Every structure is written in C-alpha cells, then in structure tokens.
Amino acid sequence: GSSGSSGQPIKQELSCKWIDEAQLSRPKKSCDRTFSTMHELVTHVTMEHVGGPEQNNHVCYWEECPREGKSFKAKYKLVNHIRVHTGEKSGPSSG
Ligand SMILES: [Zn+2]
Ligand SMILES: [Zn+2]
C-alpha cells in the first residue's frame, strides 16, 4: 500500500591502507582497495594480507600504525591489533 520511490544513501569506502613491505612494486605503496562493508576490510587484511596459518612472517602493515612494523608473538595477536586500524570492533578474548 506504500507509494514512493526509494533511494538508499551513498556508500562509504573503507579502503585498505595496507602498505606492504618490499612489495614487487615501489616505493612501498598502499595495498590499494575499496570495500563497502566493515566486515570485508577486516576480513581482507586477514587473509589477503595476514594470510592463514600457511603464511610466512606476519606483520601489521599500515600507513599510520604504532608498531610501524613491530610484529607479534602470535598469529592471531596480529589480526587483533589490525582491527584498531580497520576501524572495526575489538578482538575476542584479548591476551
Ligand atoms: Zn589490503
Ligand atoms: Zn598496526
């Protein structure tokens, strides 16, 4: 019974400011990407970057990161700190 055209509000671009290290291209440029959901971004730097348990060396790469490289002692511990950058929520059971 409703009458009227809809028009969802524009979407934002979370983007992934993940400046890898030694990346094929140079100088060390930002990962480069465009997401719409906060879940994607957080899920991006997770596997896309941090990768799964089959990755070699896990470091938090970002344009404005405190560790500016300083890795962690555990794989998860990484994705946990990454959140602070992605802008999403915190990590479950933080050690
Ligand atoms: Zn990325
Ligand atoms: Zn960081």
PDB file of C-alpha atoms and ligand atoms in Angstrom:
ATOM      1  CA  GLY A   1       0.000   0.000   0.000  1.00  0.00           C
ATOM      2  CA  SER A   2       3.064   2.232   0.209  1.00  0.00           C
ATOM      3  CA  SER A   3       3.762   4.682  -2.616  1.00  0.00           C
ATOM      4  CA  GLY A   4       7.079   6.348  -3.393  1.00  0.00           C
ATOM      5  CA  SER A   5      10.460   5.617  -4.955  1.00  0.00           C
ATOM      6  CA  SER A   6      13.340   4.622  -2.679  1.00  0.00           C
ATOM      7  CA  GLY A   7      16.917   5.884  -2.694  1.00  0.00           C
ATOM      8  CA  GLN A   8      19.440   4.348  -0.309  1.00  0.00           C
ATOM      9  CA  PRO A   9      22.159   6.753   0.903  1.00  0.00           C
ATOM     10  CA  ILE A  10      25.547   6.738  -0.824  1.00  0.00           C
ATOM     11  CA  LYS A  11      28.103   4.193   0.381  1.00  0.00           C
ATOM     12  CA  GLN A  12      31.470   4.832   2.031  1.00  0.00           C
ATOM     13  CA  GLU A  13      34.881   3.485   1.021  1.00  0.00           C
ATOM     14  CA  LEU A  14      36.686   1.823   3.927  1.00  0.00           C
ATOM     15  CA  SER A  15      39.711   1.198   1.707  1.00  0.00           C
ATOM     16  CA  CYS A  16      42.716  -0.865   2.794  1.00  0.00           C
ATOM     17  CA  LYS A  17      45.743   1.267   3.673  1.00  0.00           C
ATOM     18  CA  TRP A  18      47.960  -1.813   3.928  1.00  0.00           C
ATOM     19  CA  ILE A  19      51.407  -0.677   2.795  1.00  0.00           C
ATOM     20  CA  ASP A  20      53.205  -3.985   2.261  1.00  0.00           C
ATOM     21  CA  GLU A  21      56.991  -4.255   2.522  1.00  0.00           C
ATOM     22  CA  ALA A  22      59.395  -4.997  -0.330  1.00  0.00           C
ATOM     23  CA  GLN A  23      56.282  -5.452  -2.468  1.00  0.00           C
ATOM     24  CA  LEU A  24      57.140  -6.122  -6.112  1.00  0.00           C
ATOM     25  CA  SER A  25      56.164  -2.513  -6.812  1.00  0.00           C
ATOM     26  CA  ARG A  26      57.849   0.514  -5.243  1.00  0.00           C
ATOM     27  CA  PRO A  27      58.193   2.646  -3.444  1.00  0.00           C
ATOM     28  CA  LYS A  28      56.285   0.833  -0.698  1.00  0.00           C
ATOM     29  CA  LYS A  29      52.817   1.919  -1.821  1.00  0.00           C
ATOM     30  CA  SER A  30      49.464   1.273  -0.145  1.00  0.00           C
ATOM     31  CA  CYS A  31      47.809  -2.091  -0.785  1.00  0.00           C
ATOM     32  CA  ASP A  32      45.023  -0.297  -2.652  1.00  0.00           C
ATOM     33  CA  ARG A  33      41.412  -1.470  -2.414  1.00  0.00           C
ATOM     34  CA  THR A  34      37.780  -0.434  -1.963  1.00  0.00           C
ATOM     35  CA  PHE A  35      35.202  -2.027   0.336  1.00  0.00           C
ATOM     36  CA  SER A  36      31.672  -1.133   1.433  1.00  0.00           C
ATOM     37  CA  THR A  37      31.182  -3.372   4.467  1.00  0.00           C
ATOM     38  CA  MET A  38      33.305  -3.177   7.618  1.00  0.00           C
ATOM     39  CA  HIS A  39      33.377  -6.981   7.594  1.00  0.00           C
ATOM     40  CA  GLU A  40      35.189  -7.107   4.251  1.00  0.00           C
ATOM     41  CA  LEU A  41      38.066  -4.818   5.224  1.00  0.00           C
ATOM     42  CA  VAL A  42      38.658  -6.708   8.473  1.00  0.00           C
ATOM     43  CA  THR A  43      38.311  -9.954   6.524  1.00  0.00           C
ATOM     44  CA  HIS A  44      40.592  -8.610   3.794  1.00  0.00           C
ATOM     45  CA  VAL A  45      43.774  -7.733   5.688  1.00  0.00           C
ATOM     46  CA  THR A  46      43.130 -11.034   7.464  1.00  0.00           C
ATOM     47  CA  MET A  47      43.684 -13.491   4.615  1.00  0.00           C
ATOM     48  CA  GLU A  48      44.550 -11.098   1.788  1.00  0.00           C
ATOM     49  CA  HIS A  49      47.455  -9.847   3.902  1.00  0.00           C
ATOM     50  CA  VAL A  50      47.928 -11.582   7.254  1.00  0.00           C
ATOM     51  CA  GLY A  51      47.002 -14.739   5.371  1.00  0.00           C
ATOM     52  CA  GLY A  52      46.105 -18.026   7.019  1.00  0.00           C
ATOM     53  CA  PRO A  53      48.284 -20.347   9.131  1.00  0.00           C
ATOM     54  CA  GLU A  54      50.193 -21.127   5.935  1.00  0.00           C
ATOM     55  CA  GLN A  55      51.825 -17.696   5.747  1.00  0.00           C
ATOM     56  CA  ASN A  56      55.463 -16.742   6.311  1.00  0.00           C
ATOM     57  CA  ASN A  57      56.022 -13.802   8.660  1.00  0.00           C
ATOM     58  CA  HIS A  58      53.000 -11.890   9.959  1.00  0.00           C
ATOM     59  CA  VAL A  59      53.431  -8.134  10.388  1.00  0.00           C
ATOM     60  CA  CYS A  60      50.960  -5.267  10.746  1.00  0.00           C
ATOM     61  CA  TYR A  61      51.497  -3.024   7.722  1.00  0.00           C
ATOM     62  CA  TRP A  62      49.701   0.327   7.653  1.00  0.00           C
ATOM     63  CA  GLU A  63      50.169   3.999   6.780  1.00  0.00           C
ATOM     64  CA  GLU A  64      49.502   5.161  10.339  1.00  0.00           C
ATOM     65  CA  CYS A  65      50.403   2.214  12.569  1.00  0.00           C
ATOM     66  CA  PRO A  66      52.032   2.378  16.029  1.00  0.00           C
ATOM     67  CA  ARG A  67      54.102  -0.779  15.570  1.00  0.00           C
ATOM     68  CA  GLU A  68      55.240   0.638  12.228  1.00  0.00           C
ATOM     69  CA  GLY A  69      56.255  -2.956  11.570  1.00  0.00           C
ATOM     70  CA  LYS A  70      56.826  -4.451  15.013  1.00  0.00           C
ATOM     71  CA  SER A  71      55.213  -7.871  14.589  1.00  0.00           C
ATOM     72  CA  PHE A  72      53.771 -10.016  17.379  1.00  0.00           C
ATOM     73  CA  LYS A  73      54.386 -13.312  19.177  1.00  0.00           C
ATOM     74  CA  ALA A  74      51.232 -14.968  17.845  1.00  0.00           C
ATOM     75  CA  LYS A  75      49.401 -15.058  14.512  1.00  0.00           C
ATOM     76  CA  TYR A  76      46.034 -14.035  15.956  1.00  0.00           C
ATOM     77  CA  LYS A  77      47.655 -11.316  18.064  1.00  0.00           C
ATOM     78  CA  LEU A  78      48.242  -9.691  14.675  1.00  0.00           C
ATOM     79  CA  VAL A  79      44.712  -9.565  13.261  1.00  0.00           C
ATOM     80  CA  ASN A  80      43.748  -8.331  16.727  1.00  0.00           C
ATOM     81  CA  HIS A  81      45.881  -5.188  16.507  1.00  0.00           C
ATOM     82  CA  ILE A  82      44.882  -4.708  12.869  1.00  0.00           C
ATOM     83  CA  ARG A  83      41.295  -4.036  13.940  1.00  0.00           C
ATOM     84  CA  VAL A  84      42.430  -0.826  15.640  1.00  0.00           C
ATOM     85  CA  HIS A  85      43.372   0.298  12.131  1.00  0.00           C
ATOM     86  CA  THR A  86      40.488  -1.122  10.096  1.00  0.00           C
ATOM     87  CA  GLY A  87      38.245   0.899  12.388  1.00  0.00           C
ATOM     88  CA  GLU A  88      36.105  -2.097  13.311  1.00  0.00           C
ATOM     89  CA  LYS A  89      35.449  -3.523  16.776  1.00  0.00           C
ATOM     90  CA  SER A  90      37.957  -5.047  19.198  1.00  0.00           C
ATOM     91  CA  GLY A  91      39.225  -8.618  19.324  1.00  0.00           C
ATOM     92  CA  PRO A  92      37.664 -11.501  21.285  1.00  0.00           C
ATOM     93  CA  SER A  93      39.438 -12.654  24.446  1.00  0.00           C
ATOM     94  CA  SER A  94      42.462 -10.363  24.186  1.00  0.00           C
ATOM     95  CA  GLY A  95      45.642 -11.794  25.677  1.00  0.00           C
TER      96      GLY A  95
HETATM   97 ZN    ZN B   1      44.822  -4.969   1.523  1.00  0.00          ZN
HETATM   98 ZN    ZN B   2      49.494  -1.758  13.473  1.00  0.00          ZN
END
